[PDB]
Design an enzyme around this catalytic site. Structure first.
Site, PDB file in Angstrom:
ATOM      1  N   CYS A   1       0.836  -1.196  -0.166  1.00 10.75           N
ATOM      2  CA  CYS A   1      -0.017   0.049   0.185  1.00 10.75           C
ATOM      3  C   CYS A   1       1.015   1.273  -0.033  1.00 10.75           C
ATOM      4  CB  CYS A   1      -1.145   0.223   1.298  1.00 10.75           C
ATOM      5  SG  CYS A   1      -2.539   0.828   0.902  1.00 10.75           S
ATOM      6  N   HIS A   2       0.870   2.234   0.970  1.00 11.98           N
ATOM      7  CA  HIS A   2       1.399   3.360   1.154  1.00 11.98           C
ATOM      8  C   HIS A   2       2.895   2.995   1.789  1.00 11.98           C
ATOM      9  CE1 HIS A   2      -2.509   5.086   0.532  1.00 11.98           C
ATOM     10  NE2 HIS A   2      -1.744   5.977   0.172  1.00 11.98           N
TER      11      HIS A   2
ATOM     12  N   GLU B   1      -5.900   7.463  -4.828  1.00  8.90           N
ATOM     13  CA  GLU B   1      -6.192   8.567  -4.028  1.00  8.90           C
ATOM     14  C   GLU B   1      -7.246   9.668  -4.364  1.00  8.90           C
ATOM     15  OE1 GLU B   1      -2.332   7.867  -1.606  1.00  8.90           O
ATOM     16  OE2 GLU B   1      -4.314   8.398  -1.390  1.00  8.90           O
TER      17      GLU B   1
END
EC number: 4.2.1.130
Lengths: 236, 236
Positions: free
Chosen positions: B137-138, B169
């Protein structure tokens, strides 16, 4: 402005597997992309080295050909069959008319794609004009000798791609056959021409990659994803 | 290097979403990898920049946390919760005791991971020791400033990775927050450090990449595959 896709099929169709069955075009690797392109408004032209082809017999099994696919495959009047009937030879192709070059597969590609100079020139031209080059399963075999018209280097050099796995060949027990026939695997080709091969977690997973305008898929389960990616990559 | 995994968690846990909810650790991005590692016989130590953490509140919703996961989450006596209770600070970590460095995520990582120099040194050491560096993910925010001890260049330079998508996003409407808080997206980080970002077909698909010993995943749906990949990658 008619959007067109040139969908290549292997021209090889002969006894291959241990059970004596023949390889050739893996049905859904031609059918799923065809459906995806048509759904998006693209016109599709089929082509093979000889203008002729045969189906990989294992791809005809119920597990790989059923439901709507089987119906379209059996209906002589299906868009799919009517288009296959108009299959072209490389000489009848005008590269500049296509936005996408898609190489369907089946083990048959290992026999003719690496030596398909005329199809490689067509793919190369389509790519040089800003179009997309995509390939699924053993389709990357055609990358063997495919040159980037602008750089002169192998089109896949320095690029990330995926494709049928070496382990897959082993699981299928065809690795000994490939060795006997002096055939190179997708990972062999990637290594030879400086491409970075990225593998799926499992050999049969739906897995594909988009590196700029070069799109690749691993197997039959990846045919649809590969087609979708080739469409999306037009803006790359 | 004993069969041990260091699983990093974001230490950020403040109001983030438009509805006023807080971000932080995305539950399944910590739980799924944890289960996979434990199942394969690995010991797991959690770590965060401050030794503390909070849950991303959106990741607590039924859609993201249900069934057995919810049970283990709620079971204060679960192996998961007992291990989380022992969460360490970077100073309590010995890089030499791990074969895998795994960065779990949630939007919170965008706040602390880029500046977590101590965790980056740990990751760099594990990688230098022949171990695996993975992020989901991030989590790739951890790669901002991460250096390869062997070359002195950014660890992800010349590597192919994936991670949370810019389009994702925008769809979530968090792009406005990222811009306001001066945060960089995973794709921004990839470009800044010379990595090739390879995107999934859809922002929420289970998609992951293995480039040698550098493993990455796109989102919660990819947490399990990213963990599986990090283990299989130990032979690269």
């Amino acid at each position: 402005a008619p959007k067109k896709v040139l969908l290549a099929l292997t021209s090889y169709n002969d006894v291959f597997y241990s059970d004596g069955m023949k390889t050739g075009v893996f049905v859904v690797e031609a059918l799923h992309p065809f459906n995806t392109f048509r759904k998006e408004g693209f016109e599709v032209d089929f082509v093979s080295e000889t203008g002729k082809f045969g189906w990989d017999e294992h791809s005809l099994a119920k597990d790989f050909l059923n439901g709507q696919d089987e119906t379209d495959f059996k209906n002589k009047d299906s868009d799919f069959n009517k288009t296959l009937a108009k299959i072209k030879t490389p000489k009848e192709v005008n590269a500049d008319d296509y936005q996408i070059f898609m190489a369907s597969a089946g083990h048959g590609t290992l026999f003719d794609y690496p030596k398909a100079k005329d199809l490689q020139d067509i793919a190369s031209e389509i790519y040089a004009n800003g179009g997309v080059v995509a390939a699924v399963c053993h389709g990357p075999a055609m990358f063997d000798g495919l040159t980037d018209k602008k750089t002169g280097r192998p089109l896949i050099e320095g690029k990330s791609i995926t494709g049928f796995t070496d382990v897959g060949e082993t699981i299928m027990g065809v690795d000994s056959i490939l060795k006997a026939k002096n055939l190179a695997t997708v990972e062999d080709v990637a290594k030879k021409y400086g491409a970075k091969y990225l593998a799926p977690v499992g050999p049969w997973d739906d897995y594909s990659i988009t590196d700029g305008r070069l799109v690749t898929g691993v197997n039959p389960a990846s045919a649809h994803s590969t087609a979708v990616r080739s469409i999306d990559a037009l803006k790359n």
